[PDB]
Ligand binder design. Structure first.
Ligand SMILES: *[C@@H]1O[C@H](CO)[C@@H](O[C@@H]2O[C@H](CO)[C@@H](O[C@@H]3O[C@H](CO)[C@@H](O)[C@H](O)[C@@H]3O)[C@H](O)[C@H]2NC(C)=O)[C@H](O)[C@H]1NC(C)=O
Ligand SMILES: *[C@@H]1O[C@H](CO)[C@@H](O[C@@H]2O[C@H](CO)[C@@H](O[C@@H]3O[C@H](CO)[C@@H](O)[C@H](O)[C@@H]3O)[C@H](O)[C@H]2NC(C)=O)[C@H](O)[C@H]1NC(C)=O
Ligand SMILES: *[C@@H]1O[C@H](CO)[C@@H](O)[C@H](O)[C@H]1NC(C)=O
Ligand SMILES: *[C@@H]1O[C@H](CO)[C@@H](O)[C@H](O)[C@H]1NC(C)=O
Ligand SMILES: *[C@@H]1O[C@H](CO)[C@@H](O)[C@H](O)[C@H]1NC(C)=O
Ligand SMILES: *[C@@H]1O[C@H](CO)[C@@H](O)[C@H](O)[C@H]1NC(C)=O
Ligand SMILES: *[C@@H]1O[C@H](CO)[C@@H](O)[C@H](O)[C@H]1NC(C)=O
Ligand SMILES: [Cl-]
Ligand code: NA
Ligand SMILES: [Zn+2]
Lengths: 596, 188
C-alpha cells in the first residue's frame, strides 16, 4: 500500500473517531457555560481530557507516516496538523510547570482586585469594577489610580510568572523546528506548497509593517483630533504636542477609544441612532431578533438556521434558577449541531451582535462538508472578519429604516455621517497601532531582542513612538504592563485583530461591488444581494482546505491583505480630520511625559 | 391474503446497514395505498417504476431490504452512488427497479447517552456487488505488515458505530430505510 493511501485510510479512521469525541467534549463544555455547577465542571474536564488524550494518541500515530512521501496537497495538510508535537515536546516536569504558570496567570488576572486607599472597604476587580472607572470617569486622579493599581497589584505578580512563561514557550518552539514562540504564532499564515500562493512566516512581519505605514496618516490626524478634544476635558494635563496619557483613552489599556465618543463627538446636537426603544414599542422579543437576523442571511442566498439551532440554543438568560456565562459565542459542536450562546436583551447593541455571531454559524455551516481537520477558517483572522461585515451592513440607516427600527423621516446629513465615522474610527482604526505595537513587542521578546532588564523600558519606548501614548507614572522592570491585558497573560496571539480588520474591509468592498453599491463604502448594505452572497459563500465553503491567499482571492481578487479598502471606508472622515487639524499639531513628541 | 408490509415498516427492531436484512414476498396481494398516501416518510424515491401505477401491476416476488443510516447517507441508497454506505455496506444495481423509503427515527433510534448499536463498515477490500452483504469483522489490513488478528498500526477494525444522539443535526439523525426490490404472485 502507498504511504499516501495508508495516510488517507488513517485520516478516515481519525475523521470518524474524532468527530464523535469532539462532540462529547463540546457538549460537555456547553452544559457548563449554560449551567455552572460542580457536576458539569468535572464532566467538561473528563470529556476534555479524554479528547486531549485521544488527540495525543493520534498525534504520535500520525507521525509514523512520512510527510515528504505524500503528494496529495489536501491530505498533506491534515497530516501536518496532527504531526505537531505541541506542548508535549517538553519533559514531564517542564510541561506540568508550564500548565501551572498558565493557570496561575489566568487565575490572578480574573481574581485580582485592587482596593481604594481612600476607602479600604471598597475593593474592585477588573470586571466590572475597574472597567467601569476607565470607561465613564472623568477624574484624572481616579482614572490614574485604577490604571496604576491594575499594573502595580496584578501586574507585578505576573512579572515573575511571565518570565518563566517565555523561557518555557521558547523551549517548545525551538524543539518543533521554529525560531521562537513568535515564529510559532506566525505559522498560522504560512503557506508552503502551492505555486503562486505561498506565504512565509517572516512575510507576515513585512506585510503587517508595510500596510501599517499607510495607516499612519489617518491615525496621526485622528490622534491630533482626539488630543485636542481631550485637552478641553483634562486642562493643564495634556500637551498639544505630546502623547496621550494612557489612563485617559477609554479603557484599561487604551485598546479601544470607543468610550471617548462622548468627549470627541464632532456634532453632539444631532440625534443618536439608537433603535432600542423602537423595537420595545413594536413588541419585539429575543426570538424576533434572531428571526430578523436569519431573514438577513436568507436574503443574500445563504440557507436558513437548522432546526437544532432553534431547539438547542440559549438565546435568553435563564435567570437566578440557572447561572450561565453570558459571553456571546457561536458554538459548532459538529455533526450538524450549531448553537449560539448569548443572553440577548432587547437592545440595538445585541441586535448587531446577533448578526455577528450568526455570521460565525453561516461560516461553520459552509465548510461542514470538509474533513474534520479542515473545518475551520482560512486563517485566525478570517472568522472574525466574516462576522464583522454582517454588523456593518446591519448597522446602516438604510437597513434599519427598511426593517422599521428607524423613523422613515430620519435625515442623513453630512454631519451625521461624520459622527458615525468618528465613532467607527475610535474603535476600528484606534486599535491598529495598539495591536501592531503589542504583537511587535512580544515578537521581539520571543525572538530575543529585548533583554529582561529592559522589558518595560522598550515597551513604553514603542508606546510613545508607535501608538503615541505615554505612561502617566514611570514603571521600572518590577511591572509587567503588557501582561495586564487578557490576551497576553492568557496565551493568545494578538496579530489576528490586525489582519481581521484589513480583511473585513477588503470583504466589504468586494461584496459591495458585487452588491452593485454606488454610494460611499460606509453606507453599503449587502442585503438582497444574491451575487454578493454567492461571492462570499464561494470562500466560506473552502474552510482551511485551500490556502488563505487563494480563499482571499476568491472574494477580493488579491493574494494578500490590502489596506486600501480600509482607507476608503474612513475617507470622508480623513478629509474632515485634516480640515479640523489645520490649526493643530499632527504628530507627537516621544519625550514629553506627565511627570518629567 | 395481504402482503405483510407492516412486519418490515412497523417493525420494532431495525438492523444495522452493514448487516441489513432481506424479506421475500411470495403469494399475496399487495396494498401500496398505505405506503403512498402517507406523509410520514422523509424521502420515498422510486426508480424504474412510478409511485402510483404500481397498484395495477404484478411481479414474480418482492424483496424488502431494511436497515438504518444517517440522514446524509440516505442519498447513497440510490443507483449510481459511490459513498461509504454504497461501496461497503449496501449497493443498488444500475438497473434497479423499485422504491427507497426512509423516515426520521430520532425519538426511537437516538438516545441521550449515545446509541452505538447501529454500526457501518468503514474499511473493506474493493466495493460490494449489487445486493451483496458483508458481516465479516476481520481486522482490515491497510498497511503491508500483517495484522495477526490484533488491530494496531495500519490495522483497523472494519466496523464503526454511528453513535446517534437526539441533539444532532437532521443530516446526522438516524433514519430507517426500507428498499423494495421488484423481480420478474404479488399483485395489487
Ligand atoms: C486528494 O485525495 C482526495 C481524496 O482522498 C481527492 O478527492 C477525491 O476526488 C475524486 C475525483 O473527483 C472524488 O471522486 C468523485 O466522487 C463523487 C462523489 O459523488 C462522484 O460522484 C464522482 O464520480 C467521483 O467518483 C472523491 O470524492 C474525492 N474525495 C474527497 C474526499 O473529496 C483529491 O482529488 C486528491 N487530490 C489530488 C491532487 O490528487
Ligand atoms: C430587499 O430588501 C428589502 C428590505 O430588506 C425587502 O423589502 C421589504 O419587504 C417587506 C415585505 O416584502 C416590506 O414590508 C411591507 O412594507 C410596506 C411599505 O412599508 C408596508 O406597507 C407593508 O405593510 C409591509 O410592512 C418592507 O417595507 C420592504 N422594505 C423595503 C425597504 O422595501 C425586499 O423584500 C427585498 N427584496 C427581495 C428579497 O427580493
Ligand atoms: C443543570 O445541572 C443540574 C445538575 O447539575 C441538572 O439536574 C439540570 O438538568 C441541568 N440543567 C440543564 C438545562 O442542563
Ligand atoms: C516530535 O518529537 C519526537 C520525539 O522523539 C520526534 O521524534 C519527532 O520528530 C517530533 N515531531 C516533529 C514533527 O518534529
Ligand atoms: C426558511 O424558513 C422560512 C420559515 O421560517 C421559510 O418560509 C423559508 O422558505 C425557508 N427558506 C429556506 C431557503 O429554506
Ligand atoms: C454639509 O453640507 C452643508 C451644505 O451642503 C455645509 O454647509 C456643511 O458645512 C457641511 N458639513 C460638513 C461636516 O461637511
Ligand atoms: C403502521 O401502523 C400505522 C398505525 O397508524 C398504520 O397506519 C400503517 O399502515 C402501518 N404500516 C403498515 C406498513 O401497515
Ligand atoms: Cl499598557
Ligand atoms: Na466616557
Ligand atoms: Zn465573533
Amino acid at each position: 500500500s502507498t504511504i499516501e493511501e495508508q495516510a488517507k485510510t488513517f485520516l478516515d479512521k481519525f475523521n470518524h473517531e474524532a468527530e464523535d469525541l469532539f462532540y462529547q467534549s463540546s457538549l460537555a463544555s456547553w452544559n457548563y457555560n449554560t449551567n455552572i455547577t460542580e457536576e458539569n465542571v468535572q464532566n467538561m474536564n473528563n470529556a476534555g481530557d479524554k479528547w486531549s488524550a485521544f488527540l495525543k494518541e493520534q498525534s504520535t500515530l500520525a507521525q509514523m507516516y512520512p510527510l515528504q512521501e505524500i503528494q496529495n496537497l489536501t491530505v498533506k495538510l491534515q497530516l501536518q496538523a496532527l504531526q505537531q508535537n505541541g506542548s508535549s515536546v517538553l519533559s514531564e516536569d517542564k510541561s506540568k510547570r508550564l500548565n501551572t504558570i498558565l493557570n496561575t496567570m489566568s487565575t490572578i488576572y480574573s481574581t485580582g482586585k485592587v482596593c481604594n486607599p481612600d476607602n479600604p472597604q471598597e475593593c474592585l476587580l477588573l470586571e466590572p469594577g475597574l472597567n467601569e472607572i476607565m470607561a465613564n470617569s472623568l477624574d484624572y486622579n481616579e482614572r490614574l489610580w485604577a490604571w496604576e493599581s491594575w499594573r502595580s497589584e496584578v501586574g507585578k505578580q505576573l512579572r515573575p510568572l511571565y518570565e518563566e512563561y517565555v523561557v518555557l514557550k521558547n523551549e517548545m518552539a525551538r524543539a518543533n523546528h521554529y525560531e521562537d514562540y513568535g515564529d510559532y504564532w506566525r505559522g498560522d499564515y504560512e503557506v508552503n506548497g502551492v505555486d503562486g500562493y505561498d506565504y512565509s512566516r517572516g512575510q507576515l512581519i513585512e506585510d503587517v509593517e508595510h500596510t501599517f505605514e499607510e495607516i499612519k496618516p489617518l491615525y496621526e490626524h485622528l490622534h491630533a483630533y482626539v488630543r485636542a478634544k481631550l485637552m478641553n476635558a483634562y486642562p493643564s494635563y495634556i500637551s498639544p504636542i505630546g502623547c496621550l496619557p494612557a489612563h485617559l483613552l477609554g479603557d484599561m489599556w487604551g485598546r479601544f477609544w470607543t468610550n471617548l465618543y462622548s468627549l470627541t463627538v464632532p456634532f453632539g446636537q444631532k440625534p443618536n441612532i439608537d433603535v432600542t426603544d423602537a423595537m420595545v414599542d413594536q413588541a419585539w422579543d429575543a426570538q424576533r431578533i434572531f428571526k430578523e437576523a436569519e431573514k438577513f442571511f436568507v436574503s443574500v442566498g445563504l440557507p436558513n438556521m437548522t432546526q437544532g439551532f432553534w431547539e438547542n440554543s440559549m438565546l435568553t438568560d435563564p435567570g437566578n434558577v440557572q447561572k450561565a456565562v453570558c459571553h456571546p459565542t457561536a458554538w459548532d459542536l459538529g455533526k450538524g449541531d450549531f448553537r449560539i450562546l448569548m443572553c440577548t436583551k432587547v437592545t440595538m447593541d445585541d441586535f448587531l451582535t446577533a448578526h455577528h455571531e450568526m455570521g460565525h454559524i453561516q461560516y461553520d455551516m459552509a465548510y461542514a462538508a470538509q474533513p474534520f481537520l479542515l473545518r475551520n477558517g482560512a486563517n485566525e483572522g478570517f472568522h472574525e472578519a466574516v462576522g464583522e461585515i454582517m454588523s456593518l451592513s446591519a448597522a446602516t440607516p438604510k437597513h434599519l429604516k427598511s426593517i422599521g427600527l428607524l423613523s422613515p423621516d430620519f435625515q442623513e446629513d453630512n454631519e451625521t455621517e461624520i459622527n458615525f465615522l468618528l465613532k467607527q474610527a475610535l474603535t476600528i482604526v484606534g486599535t491598529l497601532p495598539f495591536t501592531y505595537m503589542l504583537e511587535k513587542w512580544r515578537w521581539m521578546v520571543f525572538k530575543g531582542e529585548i533583554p529582561k532588564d529592559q522589558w518595560m523600558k522598550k515597551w513604553w519606548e514603542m508606546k510613545r513612538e508607535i501608538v503615541g501614548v505615554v505612561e502617566p507614572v514611570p514603571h521600572d522592570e518590577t511591572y509587567c504592563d503588557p501582561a495586564s491585558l487578557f490576551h497576553v497573560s492568557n496565551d493568545y496571539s494578538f496579530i489576528r485583530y490586525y489582519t481581521r480588520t484589513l480583511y473585513q474591509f477588503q470583504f466589504q468592498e468586494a461584496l459591495c461591488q458585487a452588491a452593485k453599491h454606488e454610494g460611499p463604502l460606509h453606507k453599503c448594505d449587502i442585503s438582497n444581494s444574491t451575487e454578493a452572497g454567492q461571492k462570499l459563500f464561494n470562500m466560506l465553503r473552502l474552510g482551511k482546505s485551500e490556502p488563505w491567499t487563494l480563499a482571499l482571492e476568491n472574494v477580493v481578487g488579491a493574494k494578500n491583505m490590502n489596506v486600501r479598502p480600509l482607507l476608503n471606508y474612513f475617507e470622508p472622515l480623513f478629509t474632515w480630520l485634516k480640515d479640523q487639524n489645520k490649526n493643530s499639531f499632527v504628530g507627537w513628541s516621544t519625550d514629553w511625559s506627565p511627570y518629567a | 391474503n395481504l402482503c405483510p408490509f407492516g412486519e418490515v415498516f412497523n417493525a420494532t427492531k431495525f438492523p444495522s446497514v452493514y448487516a441489513w436484512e432481506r424479506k421475500k414476498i411470495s403469494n399475496c396481494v399487495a396494498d401500496y395505498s398505505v405506503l403512498y398516501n402517507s406523509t410520514f416518510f422523509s424521502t420515498f424515491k422510486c426508480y424504474g417504476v412510478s409511485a402510483t401505477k404500481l397498484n395495477d401491476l404484478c411481479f414474480s416476488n418482492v424483496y424488502a431490504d431494511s436497515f438504518v443510516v444517517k440522514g446524509d447517507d440516505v442519498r447513497q441508497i440510490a443507483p449510481g452512488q459511490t459513498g461509504v454506505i454504497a461501496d461497503y455496506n449496501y449497493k443498488l444495481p444500475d438497473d434497479f427497479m423499485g422504491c427507497v423509503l426512509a423516515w426520521n427515527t430520532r425519538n426511537i433510534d437516538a438516545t441521550s447517552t449515545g446509541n452505538y448499536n447501529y454500526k457501518y463498515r468503514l474499511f473493506r477490500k474493493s466495493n460490494l456487488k449489487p445486493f451483496e452483504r458483508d458481516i465479516s469483522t476481520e481486522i482490515y489490513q491497510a498497511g503491508n505488515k500483517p495484522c495477526n488478528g490484533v488491530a494496531g498500526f495500519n490495522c483497523y477494525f472494519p466496523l464503526r458505530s454511528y453513535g446517534f444522539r437526539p441533539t444532532y443535526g437532521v443530516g446526522h439523525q438516524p433514519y430507517r430505510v426500507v428498499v423494495l426490490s421488484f423481480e420478474l404472485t404479488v399483485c395489487g
